């Protein structure tokens, strides 16, 4: 062990609310299912309620920490591994960490879970669940049309699998309710787990 | 995303935005772990949230797949540099304590911070090699001398002294407490820590 200030000591100074509330909210689901959106609205809820948080997504990860990674199966596995480890470092610093990666394979998700659990840090797996056709009609970034046209391969939902989370902590049905309803589902969980005040 | 500023408000009881990376560099045994801890403890006792990145929480996690080949050591520091930035972006004071022997790697670390408007402070934890070796804190020197670890900085690979670091800490000539103080002064001068 390296000698550091304890998690419980860190709990006094992080944010106003006392207590160690570090953890990772791990959003998973199809491209366009609603991860970036839910993550933004959660981040807003958290900041508005004075709970320090940080979001890892493609914007701060992919052209930095993971800029030396491409799309081979081994590289995508490394992608998620690195993400999971850093998320764990943010949980351990006492921040609420929100990740928003399609993270299709149970193996990688369950591995993310395991490193948090090993460290005694809460991990909430959140299935951001919409049907593929609905995601494909949103085509937020034009990836589906590129993937269909063969300009991208290995694109989850088209020529690689999304493996539905078996026991996620919440399922957000994003084609059947509002952003606000979906967020509220995550917020309730954080309440029930004492991360976020009533 | 919520503006960096707005995230800053809620990080601690102190106000504003105090995210930055404090980058210690120096020979093995010079004083990085000791300065870090004391500085970590100064920040906590002043209600400024901070986080330390060291061999312990990085080497068997994020960087578990990196050996001691030169390329791996370059990647080791690159990854660390990026994470520090994420912590400074998150609004925490991030303290790193890696022998970061090469100017190139260090300046690369600063650069990814400067691009993003994130203060970066290179601290030169400077003690002479002979003193570090008499210290032999974790027994690494006599092991390196004995052929068990190769490429050990100061022994069979170079340590490049920082040209223009923000503070120099002469850890053979003053106390831990006086050393931390040069850093804390820097932090106060630069509006990360209040007077
Ligand atoms: N309940 C909901 N949750 C999240 N997104 C929703 C919801 N209802 C509609 N949407 C819309 O679906 C799209 C989701 O895109 P995005 O959030 O970028 O997906 P991802 O981050 O998973 O790739 C957005 O335009 C969003 O406004
Ligand atoms: N001014 C000083 N700053 C830091 N350490 C000092 C100082 N004076 C004596 N020491 C001692 O030198 C040793 C440095 O070891 P350490 O901090 O573990 O080295 P590093 O972490 O840089 O490899 C510790 O025993 C520390 O107490």
Curated annotation (Swiss-Prot), chain B:
Listed result of changing residue 25 to R: In BCYM4; patient with premature pubarche and hyperandrogenism; decreased sulfate assimilation; increases ubiquitin-dependent protein instability
UniProt binding sites for ATP 1: 29-34, 174
Residues annotated as binding adenosine 5'-phosphosulfate: 56-59, 68, 73-76, 99-100, 138, 151-152
Tissues of expression: Expressed in cartilage and adrenal gland.
Disease: Brachyolmia type 4 with mild epiphyseal and metaphyseal changes: A form of brachyolmia, a clinically and genetically heterogeneous skeletal dysplasia primarily affecting the spine and characterized by a short trunk, short stature, and platyspondyly. BCYM4 is an autosomal recessive form with mild epiphyseal and metaphyseal changes. Clinical features include short stature evidenced at birth, short and bowed lower limbs, mild brachydactyly, kyphoscoliosis, abnormal gait, enlarged knee joints.
Function description: Bifunctional enzyme with both ATP sulfurylase and APS kinase activity, which mediates two steps in the sulfate activation pathway. The first step is the transfer of a sulfate group to ATP to yield adenosine 5'-phosphosulfate (APS), and the second step is the transfer of a phosphate group from ATP to APS yielding 3'-phosphoadenylylsulfate/PAPS, the activated sulfate donor used by sulfotransferases. In mammals, PAPS is the sole source of sulfate while APS appears to only be an intermediate in the sulfate-activation pathway.
UniProt name for this protein: Bifunctional 3'-phosphoadenosine 5'-phosphosulfate synthase 2
Species this chain originates from: Homo sapiens
């Amino acid at each position: 062990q390296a000698h550091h200030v304890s998690r419980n000591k860190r709990g006094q100074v992080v944010g106003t609310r006392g207590g160690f509330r570090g953890c990772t909210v791990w959003l998973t689901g199809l491209s366009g299912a609603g991860k970036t959106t839910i993550s933004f609205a959660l981040e807003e809820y958290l900041v508005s309620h004075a709970i320090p948080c940080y979001s890892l997504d493609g914007d701060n990860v992919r052209h930095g920490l993971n800029r030396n990674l491409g799309f081979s199966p081994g590289d995508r596995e490394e992608n998620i591994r690195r993400i999971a480890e850093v998320a764990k470092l943010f949980a351990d610093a006492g921040l609420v960490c929100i990740t928003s990666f399609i993270s299709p394979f149970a193996k990688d998700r369950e591995n993310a879970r395991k490193i948090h659990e090993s460290a005694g840090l809460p991990f909430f797996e959140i299935f951001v669940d919409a049907p593929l056709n609905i995601c494909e009609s949103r085509d937020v970034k034009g990836l589906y049309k590129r993937a269909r046209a063969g300009e991208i391969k290995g694109f989850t939902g088209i020529d690689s699998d999304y493996e539905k989370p078996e026991t996620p902590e919440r399922v957000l049905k994003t084609n059947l309710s509002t952003v606000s309803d979906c967020v509220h589902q995550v917020v309730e969980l954080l309440q029930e787990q004492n991360i976020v005040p009533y």
